[PDB]
Amino acid sequence: AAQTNAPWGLARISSTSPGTSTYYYDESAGQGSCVYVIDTGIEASHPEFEGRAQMVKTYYYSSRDGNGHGTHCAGTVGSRTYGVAKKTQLFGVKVLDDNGSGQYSTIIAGMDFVASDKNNRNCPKGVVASLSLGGGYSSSVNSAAARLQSSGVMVAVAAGNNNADARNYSPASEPSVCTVGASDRYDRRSSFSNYGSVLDIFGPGTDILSTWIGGSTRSISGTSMATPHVAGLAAYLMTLGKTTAASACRYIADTANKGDLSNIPFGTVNLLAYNNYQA
């Protein structure tokens, strides 16, 4: 398959060079895979999801996404125009309120929930979880993200938008999960991107066009927008039988784009997510 005039983030994942505008992906598009989107929830009624998005849990009182953050990142995972795993099943767990805030107890309970409701769903190819939140260091949310990864889920988390070492932030500094940095249009490190040895992979995170609440589309930039690129890539890769949730992150790093990024500090990886699809 091939999508013309794609968002720069989609085309970059299917490329060895920046600047391309066509996104090349296998026709499977990650069908049979599930990606839990742990954010502000998802607006399931968006025409870009096509019944593939679903609100399965809210830790507030309404499954609405009255923020737009969670609908944007879920769009990058597997919507029609802006998703990398265009046929995946999107499950929306709402740990962030309509302001983008969220207590660690709520974020932890959301990860503990995904690991259980995973067994109540039909995901033959496997399960993915994209946690594009980020707070200060916590031993317990690092522990909760590891429990999600150990339970059989590919866990992609945001590196943080602090321009510092991601070792001070959670769940980013959890070694078991996949910490995703953000890159911009020209294969530079995003000016907000966290770095450090904790990061496992980079993704398009600057000016990422995706869906938005109210049936709209808009671009926002953050490592929280680069994370869904790796979530959908892991989903799209596990559908191909190329990798397993337990090692999707390491497989993406093995088959990434080596040394293409600039502004990478010393000790941080220089890998850009690459689906390696060749038609």
Binding-site members are: 16, 175, 177, 200, 260
Asked if residue 53 lies in contact with residue 130, where contact means CB atoms within 8 angstroms, the answer is: no
Looking at the Cβ atoms of 226 and 269, the one nearer to Ca ion is: 269
Instruction: Kindly state the smallest distance separating residue 27's Cβ from Ca ion, in Å.
Output: 27
The residue among 5, 39, 56, 97 whose CA lies nearest residue 231 is 39
For the annotated binding site for Ca(2+), the residues are: 16, 175, 177, 200, 260
Looking at the Cβ atoms of 67 and 89, the one nearer to Ca ion is: 67
Phi and psi torsions of 267, nearest 5° = 100, -15
14 near Ca ion, judged by CB under 5 A: no
Cis amide leading into 204 (omega within 30): no
Sign of CA dihedral 175, 117, 239, 8: negative
Which listed residue (153, 269, 272, 273) binds Ca ion by CB under 5 A? Answer: 269
73 near Ca ion, judged by CB under 5 A: yes
69 near Ca ion, judged by CB under 5 A: yes
Asked if residue 273 lies in contact with residue 230, where contact means CB atoms within 8 angstroms, the answer is: yes
Instruction: Kindly state the smallest distance separating residue 72's Cβ from Ca ion, in Å.
Output: 5
Please report, as residue ranges, which positions from 195 to 254 form the binding site for Ca ion (by CB under 5 A).
224
User: Helix, strand, coil shares of the chain as percentages rounded to 5?
Assistant: 25, 25, 50
Quote the CA–CA distance of 279 and 263 in Å, as a whole number.
Answer: 32
Looking at the Cβ atoms of 53 and 269, the one nearer to Ca ion is: 269
Looking at the Cβ atoms of 69 and 118, the one nearer to Ca ion is: 69
Question: Annotated active-site positions, please?
Answer: 39, 69, 224
Residue 121's CB: how many other CB atoms inside 10 A? 13
Instruction: Kindly state the smallest distance separating residue 127's Cβ from Ca ion, in Å.
Output: 19
**Per rule CB under 5 A, count of chain residues that contact Ca ion:** 8
Judged by CB under 5 A, the stretch of 64-72, 94-102, 107-115, 192-200 that binds Ca ion is: 64-72
Instruction: Kindly state the smallest distance separating residue 269's Cβ from Ca ion, in Å.
Output: 4
Please report, as residue ranges, which positions from 79 to 98 form the binding site for Ca ion (by CB under 5 A).
none
106 near Ca ion, judged by CB under 5 A: no
Taking every pair of C-alpha atoms in the chain, what is the biggest distance, in angstroms?
46
132 near Ca ion, judged by CB under 5 A: yes
Non-local (6+) Cβ contacts of 279 within 8 A are 2, 24
Quote the CA–CA distance of 156 and 172 in Å, as a whole number.
Answer: 9
Q: Which residues bind Ca ion (CB under 5 A)?
A: 39, 69, 72-73, 132, 224, 269-270
